[PDB]
């Protein structure tokens, strides 16, 4: 029997909170969704749920060397996008395309992305200093907040370095930026 | 001929049957149990007791029966010691075994080959010298050497492991000669007690608790059908689990154990 | 000869090393195991939360193990019993357990960010006292030997300073501060060296060890807090501890009575695995 | 002789008697205030003195028996050869765990020899072959299907399957259920097994082919009929005694009790009290150490130096066909009964057909006429006193626990000789290291980190290990 | 301070427990601790706690006071693969790795459950090792079967299927290493961490 939609939220529910629960229960739909059926219907429900166990993975952990003296960020955006940073400029990115940034500033190209490595906070240092160029073009316009945000929800241009497979370039991006500037490319 | 009695029976007719020498000198009835050399088995509680195995079972780790309350949970880990120290001592030579079970090695051998008269006058003096004074088993060499390589002991001894189990699994084919009732070892007794349980159990389909180890053991290599010089005793414990769900304990004496 | 338990050694130098304060070669046998010590004191902010850093893990797996009961179940069988059968003759008490689950979850959580906080809180101060030592200490280095480079009672540089350590170590000014106190460690300092008297340089010298003993100081203030708040992240965390023990130990006997479903021992056997620690590890 | 039962009354010279006669069974008549259960006792005696297992078995409602007994057995040290099974204790006051072990578990449906079928046709005591004819076939599907299902035989999984239904689902479903959650299939079994069964509903005079809602009114009038003495029989056998019969090892089997000379006092509730489930109670006795004795026995064993005397107190009210009787096999066994009742008029008023067979297969009659009898012997009639062992009585009274262990399971041990083979071939071609390099990115750097450090201590270099992996990423 | 190995001994175990209960292997088992501190002759360990002598010389009979020796609740398993994972507590897995010494493998293996339980910071580091060494058991089963990597079982086919000598069981024993299992230590690993931050921490 393929458990029904309110059943699998509740699922989803009572595992929220740990990164281990919430894998299991990943691991466990794959399971009888392969042994039963396996429909792409159900390979298409097994996709979202695969993006359900990243996603809690992606959001409870940044240890962020705590020890070493540190703080985890306690606002959760930032949280889960330096997560983010982490595991797509860690993991799954090697030359998506070798130097490419055209990040315009509202119909002016003039404050533009130096298209820098996409090595270790190297990405992240070329984004903050165009970040920082893009405020002085135009500073941080005071849209709303979320616990601590600041948004430019319309904010000039979105793609710097793309390609089909540049998903983890353009998020590593999107996240070095939005760690103070957030076009708010968030959800839940 | 002249009126007798239940003791003057016991001293009339004990030269005729002499497996019953070994007792006719004591008056046991007045001893007590659990004490001394003549002294019945341990019940599976008044065991795991001697040997302290017993655990207030707690939930969640070892799930209980659910109409169960005031009783105990067993340590596998000091379990499994205790059952395998039981396992005799290795077996390598009939030469190299206890002066005892020496002499009923022999009794078994000279049986299966069918030649009683040789087994009988093993036994029938063994216990004359018991009963007066210290027994001496070197009355039983010249039926050892002559069956030691008989094809059939060979059989059944090529193919356990330790000194109990085949001591009792060569018992399990001398019996099929006609009967070998247990009850011609009682100067077994006192020289000896894991094995007089060993030879005790063999036949039935439960053993002691005095000897569950040899017995688990027995079964499983009459099962496989091979020698296996491990222990096999992961069956003795599971039974001794179910042996002690089975006696309620009383709460004052709930208590006094501890997880 | 009083030794310390390898695995003590390993995560009583390892703190250290998050501090870059590793001043003691071997008297780290004798000194983070004499109890009237200094490196033991900057020591037990972060030990404690150690401390906590197991129990809130025990726990942690019992809530790992709630949460798998819960999704096995609830993957399941969960709507195929009608309601008004027997399948809703426990059920409903089961969909009360989610919601018990999913607030302790939610809790709970709450309890790991203040802990990751307190870590951080205190490492990021206690770090900021220990460098500030050194550096402090640095100065009365140099300065204690121009006080002592000027005695006509001739001693070297770094027997001083393995002069001075012996006096934290031998005795304390961490709690117990005075201005009696104070002349036991000049009195220990100098007993150490072979022999000194300086009547106006017990004077002289008493100005000097000033930035020691202030910076010595900010740490019982700051000891004065961490303390308070680890008693409280460790009372609130023992708890957690026994009501997921209820709610794993209510689901295995509520989940246990339905009559169409079950949890096998295949699964379980292995789900089962992490769940054989102690209880009784924080008091 | 060998065995002694007393000193003639009139001139005193004692009466022993020899095991040849001995072997034929003996007989005993007297009344319940002549004293007659001392001399059930007392000639047990007569029957331990020599290493030999006397069963008594007492349906007089004694209960200050086993304490005689126990206070006899240890007086000749073989106290750990005895069992004690008691069924005057309670009816379903047995569940769960218990204060203190009452008796011992008697089973004779585990072992299957396919014998029962002999106990069973007897245990029960056209329409009395039909009887004959259903069970038969339960048997064969039964006790076969206990050689390798997870079912065991007991007075309560073949009294599940006295019902039609569950019966005719292994007819026409061919399919197995049982008292749990479980789907069992009889399909690769032969066909030597279920065709019995499967012929006779087909006997019956009704049966609709497709659903069971219309036959069963075309049979449940003949169904009750024929299976209705048995489903009683196990009705009463499975619910009274539950700390009995449903066992899976029997401490009490009869084909060692026997063979080994060992003792078994076994109590029955009473007998001129409801015997319609009383005299049920001592049969599954007589049934078991009969019908495990004829045919069901494990090249040529030799004849028994010592009487095995099975002592039965009230066979009036217990019976089986024939049993006085002891085939040809057995009688290596050295094997006796001594047959006892309250009156020879009531003897055969007990039951049909009975007290001609137990008075003809007796060499030995014995009336115990209020000098406690006299022996009726084929030559002369002698009067005297029995004899009278007088056990003093003891003060703790334990019967014997053991333990339920197994051989182990079948899915662990096929799998054991399976990689031993494996294993085993392995070890002898002599390609036995392993070879392959295999090369993972984490063992490398902690071997790296080891052995490039030159701190000697190995729990100190294994931490600078860590320290150095972990700085490394 | 000798090297392991790996001795699958029918006999040694009835043997080895059976000391340990009398008095006789208790009341050296005072008197050789104090003349070696606790520490762990053969991998380095130093704590109070569940601490073992073992015998050098393959018998345990002859307990001198010279031939005896004290060794960490790793090393005393490791000396008897044919049951551990059954006698109570102890766990393992038979791996395949070469690079390491048995030593070097205990040891080792000690740092990565002083960074697990009481996690200094190193938490995320030791788990990504641990997880490199249980992996390789996967290979250790392919060659010998599915079913006996684990040592309790490994243990089982040797002395089940005849093997004795100091050659065919070195042969045979060759680059394998016994990786005590973190999961099945839990009620000591903890209980020495513990009882370490309770000391120094009061
Ligand atoms: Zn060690």
Redesign the interface.
């Known amino acids: 029997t393929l458990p029904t939609r309110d059943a699998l939220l509740k699922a989803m529910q009572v595992g929220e909170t740990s990164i281990e629960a919430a894998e299991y229960m990943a691991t466990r739909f794959e399971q009888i969704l392969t042994k039963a059926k396996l429909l792409p219907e159900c390979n298409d429900m097994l996709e979202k749920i695969k993006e359900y166990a990243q996603f809690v993975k992606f959001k409870l952990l940044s240890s962020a060397q705590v020890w070493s003296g540190q703080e985890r960020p306690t606002s959760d955006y930032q949280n889960t996008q330096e997560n983010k940073a982490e595991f797509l400029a860690s993991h799954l990115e090697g030359l998506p395309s070798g130097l490419k940034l055209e990040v315009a500033i509202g119909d002016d190209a003039k404050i533009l992305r130096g298209f820098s490595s996409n090595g270790k906070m190297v990405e992240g240092d070329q984004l903050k200093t165009m970040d920082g160029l893009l405020e002085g073009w135009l500073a941080k316009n005071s849209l709303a907040i979320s616990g601590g945000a600041v948004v430019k929800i319309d904010n000039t241009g979105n793609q710097t370095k793309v390609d089909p497979q540049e998903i983890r370039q353009l998020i590593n991006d999107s996240e070095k930026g939005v760690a103070k500037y957030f076009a708010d490319k968030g959800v839940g | 001929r002249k009126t007798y009695d239940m003791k003057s029976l016991r001293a009339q007719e004990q030269f005729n049957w002499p497996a019953i020498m070994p007792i006719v000198k004591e008056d046991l009835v007045s001893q007590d149990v659990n004490k001394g050399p003549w002294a019945m088995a341990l019940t599976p509680m008044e065991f795991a007791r001697k040997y302290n195995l017993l655990r207030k079972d707690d939930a969640l780790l070892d799930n209980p029966v659910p109409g169960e309350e005031m009783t105990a949970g067993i340590r596998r880990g000091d379990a499994k010691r205790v059952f395998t120290m039981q396992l005799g001592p290795y077996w390598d030579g009939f030469e190299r075994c206890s002066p005892q079970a020496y002499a009923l090695s022999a009794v078994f051998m000279a049986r299966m080959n069918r030649d009683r008269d040789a087994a009988n006058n093993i036994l029938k003096v063994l216990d004359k010298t018991f009963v007066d004074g210290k027994p001496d088993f070197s009355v039983a060499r010249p039926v050892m050497k002559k069956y030691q390589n008989s094809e059939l002991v060979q059989e059944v001894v090529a193919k356990h492991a330790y000194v109990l189990t085949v001591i009792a699994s060569l018992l399990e084919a001398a019996r099929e000669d006609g009967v070998v009732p247990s009850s011609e070892f009682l100067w077994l007794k006192p020289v000896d007690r894991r094995l007089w349980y060993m030879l005790n159990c063999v036949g039935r389909q439960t053993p002691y608790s005095e000897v569950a180890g040899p017995f688990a053991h027995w079964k499983a290599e009459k099962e496989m059908g091979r020698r296996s010089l491990v222990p096999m005793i992961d069956e003795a414990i599971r039974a001794l689990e179910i042996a002690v769900k089975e006696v309620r304990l009383t709460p004052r004496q709930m208590e006094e154990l501890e997880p | 000869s009083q030794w310390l338990s390898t695995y003590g050694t390993i995560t009583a130098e390892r703190i250290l090393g998050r501090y870059n304060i590793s001043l003691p070669q071997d008297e780290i046998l004798e000194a983070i195991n004499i109890p009237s010590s200094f490196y033991r004191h900057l020591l037990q902010i972060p030990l404690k939360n150690v401390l906590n850093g197991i129990v809130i893990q025990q726990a942690s797996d019992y809530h790992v193990y709630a949460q798998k009961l819960l999704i096995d179940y609830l993957l399941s069988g969960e709507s195929s019993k009608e309601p008004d059968s027997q399948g809703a003759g426990t059920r409903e008490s089961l969909e009360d357990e989610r919601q018990r689950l999913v607030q302790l979850g939610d809790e709970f959580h709450k309890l790991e960010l203040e802990q990751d906080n307190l870590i951080a809180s205190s490492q990021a101060s206690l770090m900021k006292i220990s460098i500030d030592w050194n550096t402090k200490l640095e100065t009365t280095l140099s300065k204690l030997n121009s006080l002592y480079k000027n005695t006509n009672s001739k001693i070297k540089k770094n027997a001083i300073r393995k002069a001075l350590i012996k006096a934290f170590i031998h005795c304390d000014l961490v709690k117990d501060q005075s201005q009696k106190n104070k002349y036991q460690l000049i009195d220990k300092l100098n007993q150490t060296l072979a022999v000194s008297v300086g009547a106006e340089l017990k004077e002289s010298i008493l100005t000097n060890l000033s930035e020691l003993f202030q910076i010595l100081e900010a740490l019982n203030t700051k000891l004065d807090e961490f303390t308070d708040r680890t008693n409280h992240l460790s009372q609130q965390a023992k708890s957690f501890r026994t009501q997921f023990y209820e709610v794993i130990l209510r689901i295995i006997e509520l989940i246990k009575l339905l009559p169409e479903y079950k949890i096998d021992p295949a699964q379980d056997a292995i789900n089962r695995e992490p769940l054989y620690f102690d209880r009784t590890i924080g008091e | 002789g ?1 065995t ?1 039962f007393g ?1 003639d009354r009139k001139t ?3 009466l022993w008697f020899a095991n040849d006669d001995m072997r034929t069974h003996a007989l005993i008549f007297g009344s319940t205030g002549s004293g007659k259960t001392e001399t059930l006792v007392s000639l047990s ?1 007569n029957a331990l ?5 006397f069963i008594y078995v007492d349906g007089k409602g004694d209960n200050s028996l086993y304490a005689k007994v126990f ?2 057995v ?8 005895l069992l004690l099974i008691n069924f005057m204790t309670g009816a379903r006051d047995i ?7 009452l008796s011992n578990t008697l089973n004779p449906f585990c ?1 299957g020899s396919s014998s029962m079928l002999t106990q069973l046709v007897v245990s029960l005591m056209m329409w009395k072959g039909r009887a004959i004819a259903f069970v038969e076939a339960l048997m064969r599907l039964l006790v076969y299907m206990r050689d390798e299902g997870a079912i065991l035989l007991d007075a309560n999984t073949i009294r599940n399957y006295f019902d039609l239904q569950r019966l005719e689902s292994i007819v026409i479903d061919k399919v197995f259920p049982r008292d749990d959650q479980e789907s069992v299939n009889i399909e690769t079994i032969p066909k030597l097994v279920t065709d019995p069964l499967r012929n006779y509903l087909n006997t019956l005079p009704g049966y609709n082919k497709e659903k069971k809602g219309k036959q069963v009114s075309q049979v449940l009038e003949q169904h009750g009929f024929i299976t209705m003495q048995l489903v009683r029989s196990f009705s009463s056998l499975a619910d009274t005694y539950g700390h009995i019969i449903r066992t899976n ?3 009490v ?1 009869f084909k ?1 009790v026997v ?3 060992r003792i078994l006092v076994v109590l029955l509730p009473a007998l001129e009290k409801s015997p319609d489930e009383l005299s049920n109670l001592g049969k599954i006795i007589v049934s078991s150490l009969k019908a495990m004795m004829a045919a069901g026995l494990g090249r040529k ?4 130096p ?1 009487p095995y005397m099975c002592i039965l107190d009230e066979y009036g009210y217990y019976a089986v066909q024939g049993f006085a009787v002891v085939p040809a096999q057995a009688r ?3 094997f006796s009964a001594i047959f006892a009742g309250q009156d020879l008029p009531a003897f055969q008023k007990a039951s049909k057909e009975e007290a001609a067979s137990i008075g003809a297969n007796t060499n030995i009659k014995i009336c115990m006429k209020l000098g406690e009898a006299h022996i009726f012997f084929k030559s002369k009639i002698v009067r005297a006193r029995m ?6 009585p ?3 009274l ?1 019967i ?9 399971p079948d899915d662990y ?1 096929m ?3 399976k ?2 083979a ?3 071939s ?2 002898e071609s002599g390609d ?3 070879n ?1 390099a ?1 090369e ?1 990115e ?3 750097l ?2 790296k980190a ?1 052995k490039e450090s030159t701190i000697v ?3 100190e ?3 600078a ?3 150095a ?2 700085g490394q ?1 | 301070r000798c090297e392991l190995k790996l001795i699958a001994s029918p006999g040694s175990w009835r043997l080895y427990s059976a000391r340990k209960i009398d008095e006789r292997f208790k009341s050296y088992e005072q008197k050789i601790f104090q003349r070696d501190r606790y520490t762990c002759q053969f991998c380095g360990f130093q704590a109070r706690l569940y601490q073992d002598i073992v015998n050098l010389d393959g018998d345990y009979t002859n307990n001198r006071l010279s031939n005896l020796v004290t060794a960490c609740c790793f090393c005393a398993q490791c000396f008897f693969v044919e049951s551990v994972g059954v006698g109570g507590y102890g766990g393992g897995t038979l791996i395949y790795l070469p690079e390491l010494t048995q030593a070097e493998l205990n040891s080792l293996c000690h740092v990565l459950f002083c960074a697990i339980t009481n996690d200094t910071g190193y938490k995320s580091s030791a788990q990504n090792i641990y997880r490199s060494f249980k992996f390789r058991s996967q290979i250790v089963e392919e060659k010998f079967g599915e079913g006996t990597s684990d040592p309790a079982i490994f243990g089982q086919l040797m002395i089940d299927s005849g093997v004795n000598s100091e050659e065919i069981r070195e042969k045979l024993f060759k680059n394998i290493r016994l990786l005590p299992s973190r999961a099945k230590f839990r009620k000591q690993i903890e209980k020495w961490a513990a009882s370490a931050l309770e000391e120094i921490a009061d």
């Open positions: 060998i002694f000193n005193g010279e004692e005696y003195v020599q290493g030999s297992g206070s006899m240890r007086s000749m040290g073989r106290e750990d050869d569940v769960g765990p218990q204060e203190k072990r072992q090892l029997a401490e089997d060692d063979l080994n000379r064993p030799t004849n028994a010592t290596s066994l050295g004899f009278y062992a007088n056990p003093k003891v003060k703790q334990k014997n626990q053991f333990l339920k262990v197994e051989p182990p041990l799998k054991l000789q990689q031993l494996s294993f085993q392995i070890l036995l290291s392993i392959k295999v993972n984490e063992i490398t902690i071997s080891l201590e190995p729990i270099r294994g931490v290990a860590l320290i992996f972990h990423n």
